[PDB]
Amino acid sequence: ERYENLFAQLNDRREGAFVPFVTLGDPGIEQSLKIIDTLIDAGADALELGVPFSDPLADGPTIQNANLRAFAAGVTPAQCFEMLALIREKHPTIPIGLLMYANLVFNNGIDAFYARCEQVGVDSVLVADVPVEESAPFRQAALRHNIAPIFICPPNADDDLLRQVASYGRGYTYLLSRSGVTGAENLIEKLKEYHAAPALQGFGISSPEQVSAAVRAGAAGAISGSAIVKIIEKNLASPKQMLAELRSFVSAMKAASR
Amino acid sequence: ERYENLFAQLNDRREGAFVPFVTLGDPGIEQSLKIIDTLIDAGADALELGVPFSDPLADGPTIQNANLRAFAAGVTPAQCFEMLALIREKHPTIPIGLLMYANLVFNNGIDAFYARCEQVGVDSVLVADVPVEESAPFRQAALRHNIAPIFICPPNADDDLLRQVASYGRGYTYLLSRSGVTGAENLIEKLKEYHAAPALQGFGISSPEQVSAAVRAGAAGAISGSAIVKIIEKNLASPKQMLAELRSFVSAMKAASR
Amino acid sequence: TLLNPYFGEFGGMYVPQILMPALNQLEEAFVRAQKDPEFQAQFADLLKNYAGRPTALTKCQNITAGTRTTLYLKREDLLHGGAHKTNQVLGQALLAKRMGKSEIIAETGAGQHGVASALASALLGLKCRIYMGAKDVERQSPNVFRMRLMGAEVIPVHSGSATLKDACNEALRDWSGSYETAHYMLGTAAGPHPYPTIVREFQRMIGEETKAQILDKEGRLPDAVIACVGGGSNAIGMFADFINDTSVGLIGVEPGGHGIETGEHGAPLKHGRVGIYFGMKAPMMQTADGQIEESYSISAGLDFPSVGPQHAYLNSIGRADYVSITDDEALEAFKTLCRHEGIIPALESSHALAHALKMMREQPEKEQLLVVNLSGRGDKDIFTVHD
Amino acid sequence: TLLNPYFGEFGGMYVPQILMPALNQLEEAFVRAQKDPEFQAQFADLLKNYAGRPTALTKCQNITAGTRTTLYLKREDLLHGGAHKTNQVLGQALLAKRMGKSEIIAETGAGQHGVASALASALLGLKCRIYMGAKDVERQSPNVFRMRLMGAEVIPVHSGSATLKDACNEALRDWSGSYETAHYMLGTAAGPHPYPTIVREFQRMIGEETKAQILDKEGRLPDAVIACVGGGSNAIGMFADFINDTSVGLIGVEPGGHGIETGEHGAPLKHGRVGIYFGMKAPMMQTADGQIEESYSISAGLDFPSVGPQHAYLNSIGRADYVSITDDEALEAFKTLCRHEGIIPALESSHALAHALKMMREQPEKEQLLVVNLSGRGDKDIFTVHD
Numbered sequence A, B: 001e002r003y004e005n006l007f008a009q010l011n012d013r014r015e016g017a018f019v020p021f022v023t024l025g026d027p028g029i030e031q032s033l034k035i036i037d038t039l040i041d042a043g044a045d046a047l048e049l050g051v052p053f054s055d056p057l058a059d060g061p062t063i064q065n066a067n068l069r070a071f072a073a074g075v076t077p078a079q080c081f082e083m084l085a086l087i088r089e090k091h092p093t094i095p096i097g098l099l100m101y102a103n104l105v106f107n108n109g110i111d112a113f114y115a116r117c118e119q120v121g122v123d124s125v126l127v128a129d130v131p132v133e134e135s136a137p138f139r140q141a142a143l144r145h146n147i148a149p150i151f152i153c154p155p156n157a158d159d160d161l162l163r164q165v166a167s168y169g170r171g172y173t174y175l176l177s178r179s180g181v182t183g184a185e186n187l188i189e190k191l192k193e194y195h196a197a198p199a200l201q202g203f204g205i206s207s208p209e210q211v212s213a214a215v216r217a218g219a220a221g222a223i224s225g226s227a228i229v230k231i232i233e234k235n236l237a238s239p240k241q242m243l244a245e246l247r248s249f250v251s252a253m254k255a256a257s258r
Numbered sequence C, D: 001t002l003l004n005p006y007f008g009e010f011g012g013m014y015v016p017q018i019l020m021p022a023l024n025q026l027e028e029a030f031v032r033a034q035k036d037p038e039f040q041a042q043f044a045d046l047l048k049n050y051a052g053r054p055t056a057l058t059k060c061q062n063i064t065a066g067t068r069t070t071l072y073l074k075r076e077d078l079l080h081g082g083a084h085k086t087n088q089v090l091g092q093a094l095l096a097k098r099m100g101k102s103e104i105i106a107e108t109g110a111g112q113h114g115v116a117s118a119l120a121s122a123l124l125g126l127k128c129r130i131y132m133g134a135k136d137v138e139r140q141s142p143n144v145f146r147m148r149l150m151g152a153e154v155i156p157v158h159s160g161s162a163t164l165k166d167a168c169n170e171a172l173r174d175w176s177g178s179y180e181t182a183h184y185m186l187g188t189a190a191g192p193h194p195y196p197t198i199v200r201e202f203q204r205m206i207g208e209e210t211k212a213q214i215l216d217k218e219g220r221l222p223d224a225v226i227a228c229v230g231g232g233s234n235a236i237g238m239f240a241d242f243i244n245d246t247s248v249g250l251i252g253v254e255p256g257g258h259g260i261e262t263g264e265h266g267a268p269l270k271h272g273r274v275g276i277y278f279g280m281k282a283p284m285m286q287t288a289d290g291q292i293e294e295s296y297s298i299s300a301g302l303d304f305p306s307v308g309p310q311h312a313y314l315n316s317i318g319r320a321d322y323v324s325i326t327d328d329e330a331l332e333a334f335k336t337l338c339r340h341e342g343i344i345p346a347l348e349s350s351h352a353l354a355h356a357l358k359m360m361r362e363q364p365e366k367e368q369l370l371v372v373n374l375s376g377r378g379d380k381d382i383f384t385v386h387d
């Protein structure tokens, strides 16, 4: 519903959505909250949050480092849900999607994980290592708790995959810009035909021009993570320059979205 | 002939023979000559000389060290024959036997080695690693050059070996006191019955009492090497004490021979 | 999929969507290959004329004196390469070519699977890059040189804990973008389907030879076949042909490390919790939070933080039993085999031996015909066992 | 003696008289054993079920591409122990027991014969002491630990040059006083009769398997069989069964070290003078004075300062040819086999490989069926070849 409204206002006002991604707790709980508030303040249409996992097999170095940075801060899944509740409390309307790894949601029990998401006010959950063929238990728990089960549509997607992700997903469909893993250093048609949730393009998006291209291609917006996390990385010793730089990138990216 | 006479005088005067053994060139050419003159002066009835070989498989540590000491002095086979000629020049009657290793006599040609022995005035040659079954070429060359081919009679000698060594040997028969190798730290009947050259007992003889035992057992004398070489070893830094000690041991040993 | 990716509730294909087509193509290739006589012939030929199959089945002479235990050792330590790992990499390499793949990706903990991949790669003309925990690379220079010597690119991983699990991740990441021309040569009977099935099928000649060999030498099936279990390839390779022979006990031995109660072990099957990682649903070493942990053991090759799905399943239905052996027990079995049989066993296989010794010593009057899978030779462990 | 101790003018028994009864008893035991079916069965069984015979005959696939040379490798590197040395120590150990001997004496240069003696000793219940040049012990810690690990007493020799030859001497000295209960397990086809004959007979299964294997795979005998020659055991083991097949060339390769003209080599057969040492009449490395010298080579296992009598004899009558391979050539053949066939060869065997590569490269259009005897695996040489 939160995603629905976001896409209503967006398209209605002929605008593309810009969704930044960052790891919760990176580089520290307090700094993380500030970072997110700055993202939103700077023009973020939605948030894609990752919870520190020990073996992020779908992430490139940039993100891997973020997780390590997070772990270094003592951040845990329980602490992530706390930040999530606090974030939702300050921003009632912004859509919040979770980038998870299967074991973190399977740990305490699949249903229980989605119940906690619902309780905290999370809108969607994309489980990186759970393909459509192994998603049954995950989407059912999501639906049961009003959580949007996010699915990935890769470049090598055949028609069969296309129909499944269009029929199982909600909120938005994650359009993989390419193969490989997350790294800033790197279908829309059929999806629409099949009534798939608005597509958001991800992986390698770092150029404000890429956003216009995405929305131009027919995507409803774009997700950018490594690009954002790098800014955090470089200005790691100057919290102030971190937010300033963060603010400028997003505005440029968001700007290029309309 | 030299051995013959020695045994004539000896037995005639009811006396046992004492034969010291040392390595030529140990610890140095000049010291060696002095050592030998002292041995003779001290009462040695005959001499058993060894020429430095690289792989003395029949010798224990004491002698092995002597050879190493010799090699350290730059002593060679050619230099040994020089000392031999010089020694014979000072002592015309004393019998001189050579303790050799097969390769040293085979090197320049077997016959040639015995010709050189004859030329230098050597009386006998015992080749440590040449058993009676492989001695043909060695005794023939010896006979041809008037050199006494010395053979070893071990404890495990059967009647067959006994008849061969009695029939092939000359000068004296080397009676092995035991098995193993040369080390101070350690049949006469049948031999006589077969007309074997006077037997000399060797290996482990270091006690003046052992000499009386040997001659008492029916042996014509005893050879002692490690015992003598040790004296050289210990007094290596005091040439004077070396000769003094050397002199005393031999006199005691010789004394115990009558 | 053509084959069932689950063993009871264990198994599956929990990998990013992008990699599913690759897995499906791999399963297709495997299924056809299995029915391809030219493929079987080629595989067999390599196993026999190049690897050294069939390996011997040695009856221990001194080790069991004074007891009623008859111990036999399946000699995989006599396989070209020094371990059982060679069997399957040969088959996977042929499969790669069957699929037209030109490069090979592999992960290795102790280095044995790395070396095996490099050698099969060099022989079959495939470019080969190996991922190794930066930590392991430094503790396994020998196997490293061996790998390079054979022309393989050994890439150390510093991400995470820089150990096996972190190497497994880099392999999948790499494969994620290269499944195109590269093939992922997984080292054990774990990971996403069809690897657990492919690896077992390419290691099953172990149990088949053993069965034929013991029937020949003893006229009856053993009472039990024992094997160490790091990830499960050697164990399942030995078990496979005996599963339907219910009279035959199957015993898997996980590393007990400093001891279970100590927490420092590598026995997830019996002391871990089911989780989802490395593309599969299976028991593993993880925190209460769901974070993945490392397995500990004196032997580097038994450090896979999880276990193969078919083992977790064989256990649940009670067909196979799993036990653990501590560092010291394995060390003692290592010394005992050297001194009494003149065979230096890998520290990994020592765990299997140690248990067989326990079964024998504990009930010396018990008449039993045991077969231990000597997965490898311990030349590699000479120094460690030296200190 | 029952058998002729000479090969033409080479051979004999040049040992102190005290040791002749021991040699004569050894020859007697051997002769009867050879006619004893229970002995053959026992030996065969150990070779097959414990050592791993028969070893494979691997056709090289990539190494010879572009030439008309077909190269096969006799895989003795796949023998339990890592080298061909295992074959004969098993037989000598059985012989010892046949004679009622309870202890075993052995000499070792690189350590391979030491390890092989220790393992056969441990297996057959014999006390075992190994003599090793104090110099070698220090350069071969791995093989040393292995030996001790297996319960053998490794005695380093500091006498002389403290190398192989000095170890061989201590063994004879020791045996001189202990032939009583101890047996001297000589490591190569040299020394006093009947060792050159016994060792060849206990290593002859190599050529017999090769002949049967190539006839099977190629339908014809090879054009030549090549083998490195340190002392001659592996070479004669391979040659034996082919001697009467005059169409088959026998090529022995001695280490050329830094090069013949350099003086720093280990090729006495072709560049040494006949002498008498180690109980035999044969060519050797000696000064003009008749002092015995050491053989030099990048590979420690080819440093025996002499050669086996039957090789010096086969050469003189023109039945076999002997060549030399330099350090660098052997090193290049080592790297080439690793990278193209995924087999790490012993630096010793590399000399044989190097020559086969030379025959091929020099006349690439020449059609030839060559068989190289891969006497051992090079795990032991990994570090040295590393530097």
Ligand SMILES: O=P(O)(O)OCCCc1c[nH]c2ccc(F)cc12
Pocket (backbone or CB within 6 Å): A021, A048, A050, A058, A059, A063, A099, A128, A152, A181, A182, A183, A184, A202, A203, A204, A205, A223, A224, A225, A226, A227
């Ligand atoms: O800008 P980039 O390329 O870092 O994209 C990040 C996209 C969000 C993102 C972060 N981690 C992931 C793991 C799996 C996945 F499917 C998506 C993501």
Ligand SMILES: O=P(O)(O)OCCCc1c[nH]c2ccc(F)cc12
Pocket (backbone or CB within 6 Å): B021, B048, B050, B058, B059, B063, B099, B128, B152, B181, B182, B183, B184, B202, B203, B204, B205, B223, B224, B225, B226, B227
């Ligand atoms: O005192 P002892 O034990 O060192 O004996 C020395 C006897 C003379 C001797 C010296 N080296 C030898 C090598 C072989 C051999 F038959 C005798 C000797």
Ligand code: NA
Pocket (backbone or CB within 6 Å): C229, C230, C231, C266, C267, C268, C295, C302, C303, C304, C305, C306, C307
């Ligand atoms: Na494990």
Ligand code: NA
Pocket (backbone or CB within 6 Å): D229, D230, D231, D266, D267, D268, D295, D302, D303, D304, D305, D306, D307
């Ligand atoms: Na030699």
